[PDB]
């Protein structure tokens, strides 16, 4: 029941004159918002993408963003000039919180430069990271100076965020619990070179991403299975492919076991 809220930001600077920054938030595995940089507004992707917020609180945040996106890129180009950093730029932000049973919540705020972490928000100020180029403390000393931006962020993580999420959660109950049953089928994948081929289990269209798929041939569990990554379907569901490399000789009697939350006790089983 991991239902954190991840608010991601991708800002890309081709040079100090060419920039674009786009965002999106994820509640659990569902994208709830989308904030393109061609829109002056954060798009709601779900009917509950506004949580418990009155069009007034929402607007307040939105503005916080309008100005933020505006102020964030201004600030970046300068740190560039200052700390003298080459110009194709890649900044990424990952901020959020995940509400816990009743009381507390934990939150985070991690920025990444060039694909790597460089700093994050600890307590009330900014802390550079593990590896975190040395010039990063320079930047940090400065950032740590701006008291308001350092008190807004704060209030946001420990204050607003949770409240927001808790709302998002109750008003979203209806869909996060949703369960979609996946359909499965088999087929053979080309034989690389042995005088033998490879089997293929195909599972697609399930909702809660978590799934179990094994080529446990004999009813008595087997092994050798090769799960693929869990790919997405533009309809909120996913796709998975488990392969096995076998000798056609006893390639018979094998089977594909699919376990998944949507299926109560029924593990789908397809015999080759």
């Amino acid at each position: 029941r991991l239902f954190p809220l991840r608010c991601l930001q991708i800002s890309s600077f081709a040079n100090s004159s060419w920039t674009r920054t786009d965002g999106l938030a994820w509640l659990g595995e569902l994208q709830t918002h989308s904030w393109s940089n061609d829109s002056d507004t954060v798009r709601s992707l779900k009917p509950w993408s506004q949580g418990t917020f009155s069009d007034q609180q929402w607007e307040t945040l939105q503005h916080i963003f309008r100005v933020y996106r505006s102020s964030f890129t201004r600030d970046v180009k300068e740190f560039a000039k200052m700390l003298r950093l080459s110009y194709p730029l890649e900044l990424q932000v990952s901020a959020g919180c995940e509400v816990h049973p009743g009381n507390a919540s934990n939150n985070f705020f991690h920025v990444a430069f060039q694909g790597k972490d460089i700093l994050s928000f600890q307590g009330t100020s900014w802390e550079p990271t593990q590896e975190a180029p040395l010039w990063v403390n320079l930047a940090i000393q400065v950032l740590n100076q701006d008291k308001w931006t350092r008190e807004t962020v704060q209030w946001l993580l420990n204050g607003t965020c949770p409240q927001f999420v808790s709302g998002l959660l109750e008003s979203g109950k209806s869909e996060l619990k949703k369960q979609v049953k996946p359909k499965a089928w088999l087929s053979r994948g080309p034989s690389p070179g042995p005088g033998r081929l490879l089997l293929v289990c195909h599972v697609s269209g399930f909702y809660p991403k978590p799934v179990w798929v094994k080529w446990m041939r004999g009813e008595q569990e087997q092994q050798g299975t090769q799960p693929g990554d869990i790919l997405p379907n533009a309809d909120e569901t996913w796709y998975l492919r488990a392969t096995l490399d076998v000798v056609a000789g006893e390639a018979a009697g094998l089977s594909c076991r699919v376990k998944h939350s949507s299926l109560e006790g029924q593990d789908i089983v397809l015999y080759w």
């Binding site: 991708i10 890309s12 994208q31 694909g115 790919l231 533009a234």
Partner: protein, 100 residues
Amino acid sequence: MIQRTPKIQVYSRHPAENGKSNFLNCYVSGFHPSDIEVDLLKNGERIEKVEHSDLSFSKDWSFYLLYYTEFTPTEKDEYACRVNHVTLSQPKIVKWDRDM
């Protein structure tokens, strides 16, 4: 950094059924930086009307994307995902196989 090269994977939202409607999916992932171009092909030719999800990134900060379009498989026609990125010399194309 300009070091993580994209991982391309093609699949169908549904079991290939020649003549039957379906969706073609292309999941480009683990690359970085974000700038990138991706086309869905039909016998080498790009499909004019394809859509994709908002580009996002994983914890390791690598970006990922899902391009897709409505299509109808036919034994003769072959589709494929064409991708171009800075970490690659030639736009890698990954063909679609109804069995993998």
